[PDB]
Structure formats: structure tokens, C-alpha cells
Amino acid sequence: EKNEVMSSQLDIDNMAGVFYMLGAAMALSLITFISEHLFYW
Amino acid sequence: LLWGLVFNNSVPVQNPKGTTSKIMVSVWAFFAVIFLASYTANLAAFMIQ
Amino acid sequence: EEAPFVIVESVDPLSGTCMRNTVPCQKRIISENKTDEEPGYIKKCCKGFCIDILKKISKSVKFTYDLYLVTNGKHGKKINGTWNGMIGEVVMKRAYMAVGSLTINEERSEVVDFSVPFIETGISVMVSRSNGTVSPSAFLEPFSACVWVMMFVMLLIVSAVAVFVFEYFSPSFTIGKAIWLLWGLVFNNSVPVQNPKGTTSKIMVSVWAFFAVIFLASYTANLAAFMIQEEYVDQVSGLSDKKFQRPNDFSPPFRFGTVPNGSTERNIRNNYAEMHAYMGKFNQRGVDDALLSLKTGKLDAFIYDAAVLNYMAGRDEGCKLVTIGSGKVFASTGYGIAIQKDSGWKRQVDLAILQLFGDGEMEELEALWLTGICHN
Amino acid sequence: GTQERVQNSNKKEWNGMMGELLSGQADMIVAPLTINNERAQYIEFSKPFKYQGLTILVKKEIPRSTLDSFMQPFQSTLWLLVGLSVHVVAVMLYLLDRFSPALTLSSAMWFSWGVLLNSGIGEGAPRSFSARILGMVWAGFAMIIVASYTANLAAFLVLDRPEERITGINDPRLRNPSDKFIYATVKQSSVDIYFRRQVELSTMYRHMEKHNYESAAEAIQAVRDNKLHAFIWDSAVLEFEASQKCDLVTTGELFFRSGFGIGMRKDSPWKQQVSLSILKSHENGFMEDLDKTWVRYQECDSRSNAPATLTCENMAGVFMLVAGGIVAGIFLIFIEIAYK
Amino acid sequence: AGFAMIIVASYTANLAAFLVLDRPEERITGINDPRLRNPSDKFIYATVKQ
Ligand SMILES: N[C@@H](CCC(=O)O)C(=O)O
């Protein structure tokens, strides 16, 4: 059956979606800050 | 408070002496710990295969 | 046809007789009564292990043969000083020979002769694969007794160093508060009192929390790895387990039994008395009906020769019915081909079986007719 | 027993135990003599009292942790990236907090650095709406990181099976040998004859006798010190040799079904009497008693691949890390004293 | 607190062990399957006549 021996590691290429979401959250925080700063004005 | 209680504890301000609020928080923490357990379990099962 | 070594095929519908591979075995059996000499001869065919070995013997030692299928009295048992079935037919010079499963025994060897055993067997016990189990110390298993003691020593010395150095030389931080804080920080957070504004103390607490979360992660990982790979061991044994010598230990209906008029039956008779009585109290039907009753929870254990039980427990899919341990025999005597008393063919068939053993033909015949499904 | 033949007298004679038996000075063989068509020509045997065979033998060692250090599962660059990301998100929380219309930067960095490694100190948490929507996702990120960490280290701790035990004769030993492990037997033996008998077994015997041994105890010793990896011999011999030291266990399955047997002289009544007595003895627990008493001393198996316990050898990395942290704190207390 | 930690740790290992040993497929790999050994009444297998 060719048993899947997944004794591998997690490099930057193996896991980048979490960092992508973190960047998306940073962008979401930045525009919300900008929107609030414009809303006071 | 709820978002920190589900995601592995940041720093909230404890609810007041309200007993029903405390019971609700306890039930939510039970749900949160069970969610984290299931997530880790199905993630290990996902990663092994 | 009681064993999976020679089967009973009715007829091939095309040729009006048997097929090309197997050897036809006539059935000279009285259908309903012995009123006349009607043999009820149906062109049946016998295939399997014993038929192949008989064909090999006939190819090596040149002789012709005809299969007087059965006397239809028994598998062989002394009744009032008289043998029946195969032994009864081979003792009265009615067939001069016999083949199949005799299961060589002293009582049978007293009258009828026997050749060398060509296959191993013995009294065995097949029990169902009970639900999985786990060691009662699963919680303490996945970490050695070294990691725990080293963690406590490091915890004590870290608390002491932290307090003494950072606290004084920077509502006070004593040793009790610090040890409680550390013990709660390693065991999934109780309620401590936060350390003072001491930066080095805060750094020490951070490093200890990192160590704690890594320890918890490793513990959970090696505990899941410990729990995933767990198995059972076996049943107890054949002649052991005083519950077998006293059925009043616990759950008296520990169902087990044997088929009457058999080798194992006579063995239990001559060997045991209370065991034989309790087995006869739970007497069962034929091998197929007995296995069906075992699979439906009505029975708990079954006693039969090692070959048939091993074949059945390995051929059936699902691996629900297995044998005790890795397979252990207790009265290993072996099968054999019966031979008329004082016959001069014993040496010839003996040498033939020996040279076939040396030729590795039976090694292939095993995979041909004995391999199962649960051999994984 | 040997059927030695030569052209000096053009006749073959039995020399050995069977020779002394056929000579007339001996009466019967009670030694563990195997059965075969060759020896059955001159003499006749009796019913067997045992069922021996040939099974492979291999050294058995405790399983071992296999984990070098704690930094194994992800990377070094992964830890570096997550650290720089912690710093970047802390300074971004500070920027978003003070700009909007109170996290002093130190307190925000403490909050960040605490909510990734699950606790620590430092009450205080952003009150700026931009930061409040930022952290939540940071706590989520830390939860995801921790969850991925234990799954990955537990997945690596359950897919480590370095045994690859030889299950029998249908193994690559029959297909093709290699230079990693070796397998052979003692020269001038019955197993060697049976190997030279068959067709594929002939090539197997050639590949084995290329570097075969010439002793049983020497082969056992070589297996004990990893000189020779596996040798085939009689089942009972190695079965006794395994349960006496509890250092190596047997393996594979017995296929050669030749058992021992009392060797009698041709055409004697003692032959028949002997077969009836050995079969009766085989039935009344006698043979089983002798087996359990004489050859099977104690069940020291403890087999079936008990899982990896972790051990004071891999967490040593974390202990060295916490010791280095202790040293760093011993330096940092004086650094902070000077700074103050 | 130690007891609670042990309970929680045993919980996720056990549910994750049950979520990785569930293989209800048992796909037929070829002709060396129990279809050749002996059929049953659960599933059936045949072809078009003639
Ligand atoms: N082989 C036995 C029947 C099966 C058994 O007793 O285990 C006989 O011929 O009597």
C-alpha cells in the first residue's frame, strides 16, 4: 500500500496561509483605524 | 473576554458577581476547551495522513 | 467432508461427470434404507489437500483407487467394543484404507495402523476478538520518571533563585507564592499572584511558561501516540484458569463445548471428568452451527483440532474470530493416512510422504489450500 | 548422520550416530534426530514427540525516543519568522493605539509576548479600537500555531517504525540480498542440504554460503555483537537460546515441518511398542509439562513493539534552554540595575 | 489542577485517536480479495450473461 511516512518539517513554503491571514488582519486593522480617524473628522 | 477565552487566553476583565453570567462564562469555556481539543485532534489526524 | 481438506462437489453439469482438475469420488451410500443393494452411486467429486496428496502418491507409487465415500456411521469412536465410520470400515477389511482427517491417536493406533504425520494439529481454543483495552497507567506511561523529578528539581531551584536574587536585589513575593505560581503555570492555570515589576523575574516567568507549554505539548503528543498504538494480549490457556476447574468463579455461562464422537471429546473424557461434564452440559451442534452460535454471542469459546480452527479463523474476513496467543497446541499428534493392519504398503507410502516433504511440494500445497485472509 | 561415499571401495556407508546404530553396538536413538526420506531408508523411525523447524533469529533492542531536540518539528527560519512577526505586530499595536483618539509600548509588547506563549505577566491590553480588532486575530494566530505544533510533533512521534522485522521466507531475503544485513547458516548441515535442494533455495544458499559461518555458538555470539545479523538453524535450539538470555528474540514462521523422533533399529518389536508409548505420553500433559519445565524457563518476551516513551534525553534541549534563560536573567538583573 | 490537566490531555488524545483509526472503505484491490475466496450476502459481484 506504500504507507505514507510523513516525517517532514514545516518550512515557510509548507505553511504560509497563517501569515497571509495575519497580514490580511493587519490590513483590516489599518483601514478600520483610517475609517475611524476619518469618521471623527 | 469570550474571544480570548476561546483562543488560548489573552487578558480579559472578569465578569461581575452575577451568578448567571458566571455560569454562562463557564459553559462557554467548556465549549471552548472542547472546540480546541477537537481542533487539535482532527488536525493531528489530518497531518498524520 | 467434515474438514476443509476434501470437499464434496456434486457434479459438473456440462460433462455429465466431474470436472477436469479434481478426482471423482463415487458415493456408495444408502440414500434412505438398506432394503436392497442399491448403492445410490452419484458421480461426486472430491477436491482439496488430501485428494492432491493421494494423486501425488498415485503418481509416485503406481496404483489404482476407488473412493468408498463414507460408511455414514461416525467419524470414528469405540461403541460397545466396535469401531464405526472410517475406522469401522478399515477394521472390517471393507475398504483396506482411509484418508482425510483421522488425527492419529493411541486408541486408534491400537487396532489400525498409521503412517507418519504430514500436518500438525492439536487441541486449541478459538475465542472472539474482544473489544480493545488499554493499560491502567496510561496517564503516567508517556513520560519517564526522570523527566518528572528533573522538572521538579528545576522548578524548585528556579523559584528559589528568582525569589532570592530578583526580589530583594531589584504584598511581597515569598517562596510559597512563587512555587504556587509556577505549579499553576505548568498545570493549566489556576490563580496565582503576578510577580512584581522586576524585569528579570518577568523574564524568568516567561521562560518558565515557555518550558511549561512545551512540556504540555510534548506530554499530549506522546500520550496520543501512546494511546493510538494499543492492543490486547490473549485468552488465558487451555488447561489453566481454575474458573475452568470451577465454573462458579464469575459468569458461570462461560460457554464452551465440543462436537461429540471426536478426538478432542475422547481426550477430554480420558483426561478430565468435571471439565468433560461441564462441556457436555453446553454441548453444541456441528462445526458450522457451532461457529454460528459463537459469532452470535450465544457461545464464548470452542474446542476443535488446530488445523480446521486455524483455517476458519484465518479465512474469515473481519478478523473477528481468532485463536489464543500466536497459536499454541496442547495435544499435538498430527493427521495421517490410515492403513490396513499388517499391510506391506506402509513403508512405500511412508517413503513417498517423506520424499514429498523433502521436495517442498506440501509447502506449496499449504498456500494452495490453507492460507487465509487474516494473515496480515 | 552421513551417507559418505567414496571410490576407494565403491560402497557408501553410514558414519556417526546412525553408523554406530547400524553397526550393531547401539540399540536406539534417543537424541533429537530429524526425519527425512534419506535416513528412513536404512532404519525406521517412530511417532514424533515434537514439531521443530527453521526460524530466523534477530537481536532485539528497546525502541528509543528518536527526537533530537525540541526545535525539530518546524524549522529554524520558522521560529525566526514568528519572532520577528511578534515584534512587528507589537510595534504595530503600539502605533495603532497611540495614533487613534492607552498601551505604552512596553506594556503592549509584554501583552503580545505573553499571549503567544500562553501566559506570563503584564496586565494591560489595548484600548484603541484599531488594536482591539488587531489582537483578537493575534490570539487566533497563536492558537493556530500551538495547534499545528502539537499535531505535527505527534504525527512525527507515531510514524516512526524503524524495525521492519523479517516476517518469514517471502521477504527480500529471498528476492535479493544486500550489503546492509547478512544471512547464512552453518556449513555441512541438514539446512544447507535442504537449501541446495530446491531451485530458488539454491540461489539463496549460494548467496548465503558466499559468507557462511561454520559454528552455532560463534554465530550466536556474532549476532549478540552485531557482527552477523541473522542465521537460520533448528527451531528448538534458538528458541531455548532466546529465552535464556532475554536479549534476542525469534522471528518469521516455521515452514519446514520435520520433527524429531526416536530412532529404532529395523524390524524390532520395541519400535511399535515405542510408538504406542510416545503417543500416549503426548496425550497426558507429559510432553507439555516437560516443555514448560525444561526448555521454556520464563516468558521474557515483552514483545509487540511497545510505543516510544519520551526520555530525559530529548527534553535535555529544553532544560539547556531554561538554564540559558536563568543565566540571561542573572545578567539582565545587573543590566537593569545599571540602567535604573 | 494536575488532575484537570491529565483529564484534558487524555480527552484530546482519545478523541484524536478515534478520529484517525476510522477507515470504513476497505476498497477491493484486485482479484486476490475475498471475492475470490468466498462470497457473502452483504455485497454482490457478477457480469452480463453471454
Ligand atoms: N478429527 C477429529 C474430529 C475433530 C476433533 O475432534 O477436533 C476426528 O476425526 O474424530
Tab-separated table of C-alpha atoms in Angstrom, chain D:
chain	number	residue	atom	x	y	z
D	1	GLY	CA	24.385	-38.895	10.235
D	2	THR	CA	26.158	-39.009	6.875
D	3	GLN	CA	25.951	-41.269	3.821
D	4	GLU	CA	29.641	-40.802	2.973
D	5	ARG	CA	30.589	-42.432	-0.326
D	6	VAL	CA	33.982	-42.887	-1.968
D	7	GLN	CA	35.573	-44.611	-4.972
D	8	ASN	CA	38.144	-46.457	-2.839
D	9	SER	CA	35.700	-49.291	-2.096
D	10	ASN	CA	32.799	-48.208	-4.391
D	11	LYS	CA	30.386	-48.510	-1.436
D	12	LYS	CA	28.597	-45.963	0.742
D	13	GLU	CA	28.323	-46.485	4.498
D	14	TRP	CA	26.772	-44.563	7.392
D	15	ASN	CA	29.352	-42.996	9.729
D	16	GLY	CA	28.320	-41.377	13.001
D	17	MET	CA	25.470	-41.975	15.411
D	18	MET	CA	23.465	-43.774	12.724
D	19	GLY	CA	26.618	-45.686	11.779
D	20	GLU	CA	27.099	-46.926	15.331
D	21	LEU	CA	23.379	-47.778	15.320
D	22	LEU	CA	23.593	-49.863	12.143
D	23	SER	CA	26.932	-51.360	13.221
D	24	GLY	CA	25.212	-53.376	15.945
D	25	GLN	CA	26.785	-51.921	19.075
D	26	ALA	CA	23.998	-49.360	19.559
D	27	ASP	CA	20.289	-50.110	20.001
D	28	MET	CA	18.139	-46.997	19.539
D	29	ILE	CA	18.479	-43.239	19.001
D	30	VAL	CA	17.044	-41.040	21.765
D	31	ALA	CA	18.924	-37.947	20.596
D	32	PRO	CA	16.971	-35.170	18.840
D	33	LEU	CA	17.309	-36.772	15.407
D	34	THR	CA	15.466	-35.176	12.495
D	35	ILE	CA	13.431	-37.150	9.950
D	36	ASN	CA	13.786	-37.319	6.163
D	37	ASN	CA	13.488	-39.750	3.266
D	38	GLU	CA	17.235	-40.453	3.285
D	39	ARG	CA	17.565	-41.748	6.853
D	40	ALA	CA	14.222	-43.572	6.550
D	41	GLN	CA	15.735	-45.997	4.007
D	42	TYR	CA	18.056	-47.940	6.313
D	43	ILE	CA	16.165	-47.532	9.602
D	44	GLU	CA	12.568	-46.747	10.574
D	45	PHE	CA	11.516	-44.010	12.982
D	46	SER	CA	8.570	-43.680	15.377
D	47	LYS	CA	5.822	-41.166	16.020
D	48	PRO	CA	7.228	-37.689	16.753
D	49	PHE	CA	7.262	-36.120	20.208
D	50	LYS	CA	7.940	-32.593	18.912
D	51	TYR	CA	7.457	-30.478	15.766
D	52	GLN	CA	10.607	-28.470	15.073
D	53	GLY	CA	11.583	-26.308	12.121
D	54	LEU	CA	13.796	-23.466	10.956
D	55	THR	CA	13.034	-19.892	12.007
D	56	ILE	CA	15.192	-16.788	11.593
D	57	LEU	CA	16.706	-15.031	14.625
D	58	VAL	CA	17.350	-11.324	15.167
D	59	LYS	CA	18.673	-9.139	18.013
D	60	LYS	CA	16.076	-7.054	19.880
D	61	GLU	CA	16.737	-3.617	21.477
D	62	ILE	CA	14.476	-1.161	23.363
D	63	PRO	CA	12.697	1.196	20.888
D	64	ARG	CA	14.279	4.649	21.749
D	65	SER	CA	12.738	8.185	21.560
D	66	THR	CA	14.276	9.337	18.147
D	67	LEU	CA	13.757	13.084	18.818
D	68	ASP	CA	16.981	15.090	18.752
D	69	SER	CA	15.718	18.312	20.361
D	70	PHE	CA	12.583	20.418	20.677
D	71	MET	CA	13.442	22.594	17.641
D	72	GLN	CA	12.882	19.546	15.362
D	73	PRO	CA	9.297	19.892	14.030
D	74	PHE	CA	9.044	23.246	12.254
D	75	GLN	CA	12.328	24.933	11.295
D	76	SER	CA	14.859	27.470	12.473
D	77	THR	CA	13.589	30.020	9.945
D	78	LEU	CA	10.050	29.356	11.196
D	79	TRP	CA	10.964	30.383	14.750
D	80	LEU	CA	12.901	33.390	13.452
D	81	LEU	CA	9.928	34.471	11.323
D	82	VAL	CA	7.424	34.029	14.149
D	83	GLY	CA	9.669	36.061	16.455
D	84	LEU	CA	10.057	38.933	14.021
D	85	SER	CA	6.295	38.733	13.439
D	86	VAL	CA	5.687	39.036	17.192
D	87	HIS	CA	7.878	42.140	17.242
D	88	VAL	CA	6.191	43.621	14.155
D	89	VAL	CA	2.674	43.036	15.480
D	90	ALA	CA	3.636	44.501	18.876
D	91	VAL	CA	5.035	47.688	17.352
D	92	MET	CA	2.005	47.860	15.036
D	93	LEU	CA	-0.341	47.560	18.023
D	94	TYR	CA	1.575	50.408	19.654
D	95	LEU	CA	1.366	52.542	16.502
D	96	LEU	CA	-2.369	51.927	16.063
D	97	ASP	CA	-3.067	52.559	19.767
D	98	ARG	CA	-1.398	55.941	20.323
D	99	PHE	CA	-2.317	57.350	16.901
D	100	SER	CA	-6.078	56.854	17.298
D	101	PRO	CA	-8.114	59.198	19.575
D	102	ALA	CA	-3.525	53.520	26.478
D	103	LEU	CA	-0.885	50.955	25.589
D	104	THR	CA	2.564	52.271	26.445
D	105	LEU	CA	4.739	50.347	24.017
D	106	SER	CA	6.433	48.232	26.698
D	107	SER	CA	3.061	47.058	28.022
D	108	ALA	CA	1.736	46.265	24.539
D	109	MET	CA	4.865	44.257	23.713
D	110	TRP	CA	4.512	42.406	27.025
D	111	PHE	CA	0.863	41.657	26.221
D	112	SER	CA	1.819	40.324	22.784
D	113	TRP	CA	4.781	38.347	24.027
D	114	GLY	CA	2.556	36.864	26.766
D	115	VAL	CA	-0.458	35.967	24.595
D	116	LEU	CA	1.638	33.788	22.359
D	117	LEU	CA	3.224	31.743	24.897
D	118	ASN	CA	0.016	31.246	26.835
D	119	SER	CA	0.749	33.305	29.815
D	120	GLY	CA	3.092	35.418	31.650
D	121	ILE	CA	2.709	38.691	33.239
D	122	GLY	CA	1.575	42.141	32.427
D	123	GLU	CA	-1.938	43.249	32.885
D	124	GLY	CA	-2.768	45.900	30.351
D	125	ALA	CA	-4.361	45.409	26.998
D	126	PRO	CA	-5.029	47.735	24.139
D	127	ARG	CA	-7.973	50.196	24.484
D	128	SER	CA	-7.607	51.626	20.911
D	129	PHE	CA	-10.325	50.247	18.576
D	130	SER	CA	-7.720	49.504	15.878
D	131	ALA	CA	-5.631	47.476	18.329
D	132	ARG	CA	-8.629	45.694	19.791
D	133	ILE	CA	-9.542	44.419	16.350
D	134	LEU	CA	-5.884	43.610	15.747
D	135	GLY	CA	-5.217	41.399	18.787
D	136	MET	CA	-8.114	39.096	18.595
D	137	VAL	CA	-6.655	37.812	15.330
D	138	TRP	CA	-3.237	37.600	17.008
D	139	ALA	CA	-4.661	35.342	19.722
D	140	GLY	CA	-6.198	33.311	16.906
D	141	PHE	CA	-2.803	33.106	15.212
D	142	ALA	CA	-1.147	31.919	18.429
D	143	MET	CA	-3.862	29.289	18.908
D	144	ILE	CA	-3.375	28.067	15.329
D	145	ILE	CA	0.420	27.932	15.792
D	146	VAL	CA	0.147	25.934	19.023
D	147	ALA	CA	-2.416	23.568	17.490
D	148	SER	CA	-0.225	22.972	14.430
D	149	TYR	CA	2.776	22.346	16.703
D	150	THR	CA	1.355	19.568	18.727
D	151	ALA	CA	-0.292	17.899	15.769
D	152	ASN	CA	2.951	17.903	13.810
D	153	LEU	CA	5.139	16.611	16.630
D	154	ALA	CA	2.519	13.974	17.475
D	155	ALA	CA	2.267	12.967	13.840
D	156	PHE	CA	6.046	12.550	13.747
D	157	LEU	CA	6.004	10.571	17.016
D	158	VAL	CA	3.525	7.964	15.600
D	159	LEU	CA	5.007	7.268	12.095
D	160	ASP	CA	8.421	6.074	13.356
D	161	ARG	CA	8.742	2.307	12.821
D	162	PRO	CA	12.473	1.520	12.396
D	163	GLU	CA	12.117	-2.258	12.939
D	164	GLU	CA	10.924	-3.713	9.595
D	165	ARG	CA	11.015	-7.178	11.112
D	166	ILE	CA	11.512	-10.198	8.854
D	167	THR	CA	8.119	-11.912	8.682
D	168	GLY	CA	9.308	-15.132	7.031
D	169	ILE	CA	10.686	-16.509	3.759
D	170	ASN	CA	8.649	-14.238	1.443
D	171	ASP	CA	10.901	-11.300	2.410
D	172	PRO	CA	13.551	-9.513	0.278
D	173	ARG	CA	15.982	-12.110	1.640
D	174	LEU	CA	14.513	-14.448	-0.981
D	175	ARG	CA	14.264	-11.740	-3.657
D	176	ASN	CA	17.760	-10.230	-3.481
D	177	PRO	CA	20.351	-9.813	-0.702
D	178	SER	CA	22.212	-6.602	0.088
D	179	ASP	CA	25.315	-5.424	1.954
D	180	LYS	CA	23.487	-3.960	4.971
D	181	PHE	CA	22.492	-7.221	6.678
D	182	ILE	CA	23.667	-10.778	6.026
D	183	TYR	CA	22.043	-14.186	6.398
D	184	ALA	CA	23.513	-17.702	6.183
D	185	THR	CA	23.884	-20.911	8.195
D	186	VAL	CA	26.473	-23.463	9.333
D	187	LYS	CA	28.247	-25.328	6.543
D	188	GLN	CA	27.729	-29.098	6.194
D	189	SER	CA	24.307	-29.194	7.830
D	190	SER	CA	20.844	-30.508	7.018
D	191	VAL	CA	19.562	-26.962	6.463
D	192	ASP	CA	22.318	-26.482	3.880
D	193	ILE	CA	21.208	-29.671	2.104
D	194	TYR	CA	17.578	-28.528	2.099
D	195	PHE	CA	18.677	-25.149	0.705
D	196	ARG	CA	20.757	-26.791	-2.035
D	197	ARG	CA	17.720	-28.995	-2.793
D	198	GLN	CA	15.191	-26.528	-4.225
D	199	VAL	CA	15.601	-24.228	-7.222
D	200	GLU	CA	15.261	-20.719	-5.773
D	201	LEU	CA	16.626	-22.034	-2.482
D	202	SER	CA	19.738	-22.977	-4.475
D	203	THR	CA	20.395	-19.330	-5.359
D	204	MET	CA	19.563	-18.372	-1.769
D	205	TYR	CA	22.072	-20.939	-0.486
D	206	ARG	CA	24.692	-19.629	-2.916
D	207	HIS	CA	24.186	-16.034	-1.757
D	208	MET	CA	24.322	-17.240	1.870
D	209	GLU	CA	27.341	-19.578	1.619
D	210	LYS	CA	29.190	-16.738	-0.089
D	211	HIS	CA	29.890	-15.650	3.514
D	212	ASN	CA	28.501	-18.520	5.613
D	213	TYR	CA	29.647	-19.323	9.145
D	214	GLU	CA	30.824	-22.685	10.499
D	215	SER	CA	29.559	-22.779	14.100
D	216	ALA	CA	26.402	-22.313	16.155
D	217	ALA	CA	27.769	-20.671	19.311
D	218	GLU	CA	30.069	-18.469	17.218
D	219	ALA	CA	27.063	-17.358	15.164
D	220	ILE	CA	25.103	-16.635	18.358
D	221	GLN	CA	27.985	-14.528	19.679
D	222	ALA	CA	28.285	-12.696	16.351
D	223	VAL	CA	24.566	-11.895	16.466
D	224	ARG	CA	24.987	-10.643	20.044
D	225	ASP	CA	27.659	-8.118	18.974
D	226	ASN	CA	26.055	-7.172	15.618
D	227	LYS	CA	28.731	-8.997	13.595
D	228	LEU	CA	26.226	-11.253	11.820
D	229	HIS	CA	22.629	-10.089	11.535
D	230	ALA	CA	20.577	-13.295	11.191
D	231	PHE	CA	21.253	-17.038	10.884
D	232	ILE	CA	18.861	-19.933	10.322
D	233	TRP	CA	19.006	-23.079	12.459
D	234	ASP	CA	16.775	-25.590	14.241
D	235	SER	CA	13.708	-24.072	15.901
D	236	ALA	CA	14.106	-25.598	19.368
D	237	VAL	CA	17.794	-24.666	19.670
D	238	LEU	CA	17.339	-20.941	19.046
D	239	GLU	CA	14.028	-20.992	20.936
D	240	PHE	CA	15.910	-22.157	24.028
D	241	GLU	CA	18.805	-19.780	23.316
D	242	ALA	CA	16.377	-16.827	23.212
D	243	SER	CA	14.554	-17.486	26.496
D	244	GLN	CA	17.820	-17.988	28.403
D	245	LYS	CA	19.402	-14.536	27.925
D	246	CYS	CA	16.379	-12.343	27.050
D	247	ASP	CA	18.475	-10.318	24.597
D	248	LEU	CA	17.374	-11.602	21.162
D	249	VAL	CA	14.002	-12.955	20.026
D	250	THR	CA	12.940	-15.280	17.227
D	251	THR	CA	11.027	-14.214	14.110
D	252	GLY	CA	9.427	-15.481	10.906
D	253	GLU	CA	7.285	-18.617	10.649
D	254	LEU	CA	8.336	-22.264	10.631
D	255	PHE	CA	7.723	-23.821	7.204
D	256	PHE	CA	9.894	-26.965	7.245
D	257	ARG	CA	7.620	-29.327	9.187
D	258	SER	CA	10.150	-32.059	10.015
D	259	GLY	CA	10.003	-33.068	13.664
D	260	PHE	CA	12.234	-35.172	15.877
D	261	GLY	CA	11.686	-38.846	16.625
D	262	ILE	CA	13.100	-41.868	18.445
D	263	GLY	CA	15.364	-43.747	16.047
D	264	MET	CA	14.833	-47.500	16.272
D	265	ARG	CA	16.698	-50.423	14.718
D	266	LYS	CA	14.993	-52.063	11.735
D	267	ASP	CA	12.214	-54.599	12.396
D	268	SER	CA	12.076	-54.754	16.178
D	269	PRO	CA	9.026	-55.034	18.463
D	270	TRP	CA	10.461	-52.179	20.539
D	271	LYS	CA	9.681	-49.920	17.561
D	272	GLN	CA	5.924	-50.497	17.765
D	273	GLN	CA	5.922	-50.565	21.494
D	274	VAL	CA	7.795	-47.333	21.439
D	275	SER	CA	5.365	-45.575	19.129
D	276	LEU	CA	2.372	-46.501	21.203
D	277	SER	CA	4.066	-45.315	24.377
D	278	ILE	CA	5.221	-41.983	22.922
D	279	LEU	CA	1.750	-41.199	21.610
D	280	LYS	CA	0.173	-41.991	24.994
D	281	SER	CA	2.707	-39.796	26.671
D	282	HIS	CA	1.883	-36.990	24.164
D	283	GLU	CA	-1.730	-37.049	25.329
D	284	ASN	CA	-1.395	-36.911	29.147
D	285	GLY	CA	0.191	-33.460	29.640
D	286	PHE	CA	3.565	-35.190	29.948
D	287	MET	CA	5.244	-33.644	26.900
D	288	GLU	CA	3.700	-30.249	27.668
D	289	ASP	CA	4.979	-30.483	31.253
D	290	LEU	CA	8.492	-31.372	30.090
D	291	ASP	CA	8.412	-28.499	27.586
D	292	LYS	CA	7.240	-25.931	30.139
D	293	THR	CA	9.764	-27.225	32.676
D	294	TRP	CA	12.990	-27.823	30.742
D	295	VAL	CA	13.174	-25.549	27.661
D	296	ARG	CA	10.635	-22.784	28.418
D	297	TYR	CA	12.008	-21.332	31.655
D	298	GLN	CA	10.342	-17.898	31.708
D	299	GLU	CA	8.343	-15.769	29.274
D	300	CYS	CA	10.719	-12.799	28.936
D	301	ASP	CA	9.222	-11.717	25.585
D	302	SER	CA	7.621	-8.325	26.365
D	303	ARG	CA	7.235	-8.057	22.583
D	304	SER	CA	4.724	-6.352	20.215
D	305	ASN	CA	6.501	-3.003	19.817
D	306	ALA	CA	5.656	-1.039	22.947
D	307	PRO	CA	5.395	2.621	21.840
D	308	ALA	CA	8.130	5.210	22.276
D	309	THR	CA	8.400	6.543	25.757
D	310	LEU	CA	9.964	10.096	25.556
D	311	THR	CA	13.027	10.444	27.732
D	312	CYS	CA	15.414	12.661	29.687
D	313	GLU	CA	17.482	12.762	26.505
D	314	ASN	CA	15.310	14.904	24.189
D	315	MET	CA	13.894	17.353	26.750
D	316	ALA	CA	17.539	18.000	27.625
D	317	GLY	CA	17.363	20.671	24.930
D	318	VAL	CA	14.561	22.461	26.764
D	319	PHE	CA	16.445	22.107	30.053
D	320	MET	CA	19.548	23.660	28.484
D	321	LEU	CA	17.306	26.417	27.111
D	322	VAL	CA	15.854	27.184	30.546
D	323	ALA	CA	19.357	27.106	32.043
D	324	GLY	CA	20.496	29.618	29.433
D	325	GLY	CA	17.438	31.665	30.341
D	326	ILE	CA	18.474	31.534	34.004
D	327	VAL	CA	21.932	32.787	33.003
D	328	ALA	CA	20.392	35.512	30.835
D	329	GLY	CA	18.289	36.618	33.802
D	330	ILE	CA	21.335	36.623	36.082
D	331	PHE	CA	22.925	39.013	33.585
D	332	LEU	CA	19.748	41.031	32.987
D	333	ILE	CA	19.167	41.792	36.680
D	334	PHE	CA	22.513	43.606	36.796
D	335	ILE	CA	21.859	45.173	33.378
D	336	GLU	CA	18.561	46.592	34.658
D	337	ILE	CA	20.184	47.706	37.929
D	338	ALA	CA	22.726	49.677	35.898
D	339	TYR	CA	20.012	51.076	33.617
D	340	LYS	CA	17.963	52.239	36.614
